[PDB]
Design a protein around this nucleic acid. Sequence first.
RNA 1: GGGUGAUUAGCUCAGCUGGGAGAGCACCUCCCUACAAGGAGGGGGUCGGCGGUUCGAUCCCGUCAUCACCCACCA
RNA 2: CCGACUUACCAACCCGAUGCAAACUGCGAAUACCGGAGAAUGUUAUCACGGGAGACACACGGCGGGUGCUAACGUCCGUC
RNA 3: UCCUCCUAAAGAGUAACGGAGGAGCACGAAGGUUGGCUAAUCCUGGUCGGACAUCAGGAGGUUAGUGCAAUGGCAUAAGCC
RNA 4: GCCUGGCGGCCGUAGCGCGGUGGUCCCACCUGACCCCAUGCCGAACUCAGAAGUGAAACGCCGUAGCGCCGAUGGUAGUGUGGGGUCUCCCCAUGCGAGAGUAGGGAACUGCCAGGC
Lengths: 79, 94, 50, 178, 136, 116
Amino acid sequence: GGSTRNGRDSEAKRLGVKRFGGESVLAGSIIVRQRGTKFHAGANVGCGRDHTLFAKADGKVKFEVKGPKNRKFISIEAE
Amino acid sequence: MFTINAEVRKEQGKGASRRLRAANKFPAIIYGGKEAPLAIELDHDKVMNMQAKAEFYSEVLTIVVDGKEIKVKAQDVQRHPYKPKLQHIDFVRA
Amino acid sequence: GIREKIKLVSSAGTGHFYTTTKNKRTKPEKLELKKFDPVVRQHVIYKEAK
Amino acid sequence: AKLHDYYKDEVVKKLMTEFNYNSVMQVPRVEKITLNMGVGEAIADKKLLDNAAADLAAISGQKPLITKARKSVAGFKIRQGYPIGCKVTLRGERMWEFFERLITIAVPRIRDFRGLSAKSFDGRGNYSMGVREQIIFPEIDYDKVDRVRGLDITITTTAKSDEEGRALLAAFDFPFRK
Amino acid sequence: MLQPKRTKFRKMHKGRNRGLAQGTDVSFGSFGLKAVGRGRLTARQIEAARRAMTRAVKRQGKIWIRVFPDKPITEKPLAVRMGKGKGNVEYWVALIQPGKVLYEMDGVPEELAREAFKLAAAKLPIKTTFVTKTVM
Amino acid sequence: DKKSARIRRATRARRKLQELGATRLVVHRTPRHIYAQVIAPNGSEVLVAASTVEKAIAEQLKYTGNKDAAAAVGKAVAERALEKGIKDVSFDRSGFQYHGRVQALADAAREAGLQF
RNA sequence: GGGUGAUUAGCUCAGCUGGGAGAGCACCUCCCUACAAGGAGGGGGUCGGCGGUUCGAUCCCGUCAUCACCCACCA
RNA sequence: CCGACUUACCAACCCGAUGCAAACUGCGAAUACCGGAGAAUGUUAUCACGGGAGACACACGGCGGGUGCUAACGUCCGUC
RNA sequence: UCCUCCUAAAGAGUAACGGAGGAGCACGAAGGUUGGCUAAUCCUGGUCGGACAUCAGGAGGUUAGUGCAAUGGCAUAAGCC
RNA sequence: GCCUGGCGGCCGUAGCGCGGUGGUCCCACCUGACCCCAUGCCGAACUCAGAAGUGAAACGCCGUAGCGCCGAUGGUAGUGUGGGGUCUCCCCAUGCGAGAGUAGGGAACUGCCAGGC
C-alpha cells in the first residue's frame, strides 16, 4: 500500500471495579467511549443519560444485577 | 447377554478415572426410570466382549448391585481417541 | 472549506456580531435565531446573515 | 347504532340461534371500508394531484390526512418522509353511513353491474366492490366531468372467515357473479 | 482441487494441533480408515487416495470422505528472503490427529475394504489403521 | 388488550419520579368505576384506599363513573391521607390523561387537604 | 513475483459528478444504377466478474478475470 | 392453462449424520489483577520532598502465542 | 498526526513496512422540550399499476434506522412524527 | 378459602398454538353525542351522559410435551500448584472443573389492598 496503521487503544481504563471508594466524591462506574451498559440505583441520584453512579460520600461502591433482563446496576453500600 | 455384577464408587474425576482405568476396571452409570442416578465401577472381563455383539444395545441387560439384580438397557459409549480403550458407559433403567 | 465563517447583525444595532459557519456565495439560506448579548445580558435578535 | 340494531337480531340467525351457535356476537359484522386515494404518482409535476383530495366530498365525508411513504425508492422519485396519498378512509360512524349509500340509490346509473366481487375472498371481509369508473351519486346541478375517475373499496372485517362472511354478505342485498 | 470459492479472510495463523478433535466413531458406513498419529494433510493426497480406492472397489458400494482442508496457507513462488508481507494461497492444508476417521465404506466385503484402504494409505504421510462399525 | 400501550407512556416518568421516591397514589379508572390507592415504595404495604365502589358514593351518585363521582373519591382519599399524615409527594396516574375525571379527582383532593 | 493504469455496439471510442447509454464505419433495407460514393430508415448493449456503501452503482470501495507496460537495480 | 417424465439439481424454514472460526456468540471455567478491616514475621523494608547519579545497545532456560519449511547457534511479543 | 475492530493471554502496558475500515468536516438541523409512534425482508390479495409503487393481513425479528468507518448503546427508544 | 381488578416483588420453567370456562360481582365490547372537549384523519386516543344488548372479539383463570423455553449424574475439555520423563509434548499426585450429548423439567411462584361468593 499504503498502510494498515495499527494506531492505539489509548489508556483511561476502568475505575468501577470491586468494593472501593473515595473520600469527598466518587464516580463508581465512570467509563470512556461506552454508554448504556451500566445503570444507577438506590436513593442517591447518579448522572443523567449516561446513568453513571456519582456520590459525594466516603461510602463504597455497590454492584448489583436487577429487574428485567437482569441488567447491571450500581449504588452506594451502607456501613 | 446373561447377568453381570457391579460395585458402588465414591471417589471420582480425572486421576481417579485414570486410576480406575488401569487395565482392570471401567466407570459406569445407571439413570432414568423415575429413580436417581447411581455411580458404579465395573470389572473389565465380560462387558468388553459383550459390546462386540449388536444385541448388547437392542436387548435389555440384568445387572447386580449391592447383591440385588435389576433390568437396564445400553444408551451411550465413550471411547479413547488414540488407543482401542473404553473410557465411560451409560445405562438407562427399564 | 467552501461553507466558511460568517457574522450576523442585530436588531439592537450591537457592535458585537454573532458568528456561525454558513454558505452565502453558492448556497444562501440566511439565519435569524436570537442569542445572548454583551451590553445588557438579556439577548438580542441576530438576523439577516449578510 | 341504527344499522347494527337490525343485524344483531333480525337477520343472519343461522349463525346466532341454529346449530353450533348460541353466542349472538360470534358472527362477523361490518366496521371498516378500505377507501384510499394516492397522490405520490405525480411527484415530478407536484401540482397535478395537489387538489384532487379536496373533491372527494361525494365519496368520503371525512377530513383527509397528509400521509408519508413506506420506503425511499428512486424510480418513483420518492423519499420515506414524502407524502404518498390522502387517506380519507371510512371506519365506524361514516362507514355505515356509506354502506347505506353504496348500491342502494344509484341503481339506474350503472353501465353493466355483472356481479362486482366473484373471487379473492380469504378471511378478513375480502369482498372488493369498487366501481371501475364512477357513476356519480344523485346530487344537485352538476354539468362538467372528467375521464378515468373511480374508487377501490373492500369492506374488511376483524374476522378470520369469508365462508362465515358469505352469510354477512347474504344478510343484506349484494349481487355476486354467477 | 478442494478449496472454497469465497473467503472472508485468506491471511491466517498457521497454528498447532491439539491431538484430540472430533472423530473415532464410524457413522457413514460399516468400515473405515483411522489416522492413528499426528501429521499434515493436502488436497492432492486426498485425490490420490480417492484415485486409489476407485481401482479396488471400481463402481461397487458408496464411498464417504468426512475430511476437507482446515485453513488457507500462504506461500511465495520461488526460494526467497522473507519480508514485505505474506505471499498468496494456491492450496489449503489440515493438521490431522489420531482419532480422525478419514474414509468410510459399506456396500463392499471387509477383506476388500481393508485392501482398498491399504492401497489408499500408501498415498498418505503417516501409518494408518483399519476400523469397524463397533455395533453402536 | 386496550391498556398495555397506555401503561407504556408512563415508564419514563415513573423512573424520573423515582428520584423523589416515596408513596404512589395509583389513580386508576374504568367506564363504571374510579379508584385511588396509596402504595409503599416497595409494593409491600398500602397506606390508604378510596373508590366509587364505597357505600358513601354508590348510593349518592347516579353512575359510579360520573365526573362528580371522581371528585367524591378525590375528597375521600384526601381526608384519609391527612389522617395518615401523608405530606407533599408526587402524583401517580397509571398512564391516564390528567385532563378529565383524573383532574376532577386531583382538584377535589387539593381542596380536601391532599398535599399536591 | 513487485508496481501503475484500463475494460461500453462487430471495430476504434465519447460520456469518470452517484441519476434511466451515445458518434463514425459496418450490418440490413429503400431512393439513385450493377457498385465504392450521395441521401434516408431500421436493429442489438448485465457499459468485465462477484459482494459491499446508498434513495440510487457503468460510476465509489474491496477482490478476482483479462489486457498494456515498467522493475528484478544493491558488491 | 396449466399437466406428466427426469435430475448425488437448488432451497426459505426445521432437523440428523459430519468437520470448523482472532477480525462470530441464543453456553462458559481455573488462576491472575485491585480495595477495606485484621493478625504474624522483617532487613523501618514504605511514600514524599531536597543534594549527587548512572542508564534508556543485552543473552539464556521453562510456560504460552504470532512469524519461518511446527527450518536455522531463526524471528516478533507476552509470562516467570 | 488523529479514530479503532483483531493480534492481547477476560490487571494496565504491548510486537509485523501484519489484517481490516475511517478523520483533518459537515449538521441551525439530525439542537432544547411537551406529547405521540414502531422496522427491514419475504408471502398473498387489492381501481383506472402493466416483477415494483398507492395499501390490507400474515410470516419475520435487538436483520431497519442513526450525518460519516468498526465495535458498543438504542423500544423508557438516542430511531421517526 | 375461591375469585374479579389494581400497582408491585422476582427476571421466565411462567410463553404461543390447541383445548376447557365465567360476567352474579368485576370488565371489554357496546348505547348516545347536538351538549364540557377533541383529532397532523377519527368519538382511535381523549372528552361527557351511560346500560338497550353480549360472554363473541377482548379479558382473567385453568388443562395439555405441537412449537417457543430450560437441562442432571458420570466421563471428557480447560485450569491452579507441586513433582517426574521414552520432551514440535506427555505422565504422576492433588484443589477447581466446563459446554455439547443423554435421562429429565416445562404451561410459574406471589405481596399488599378494595369488592363479589
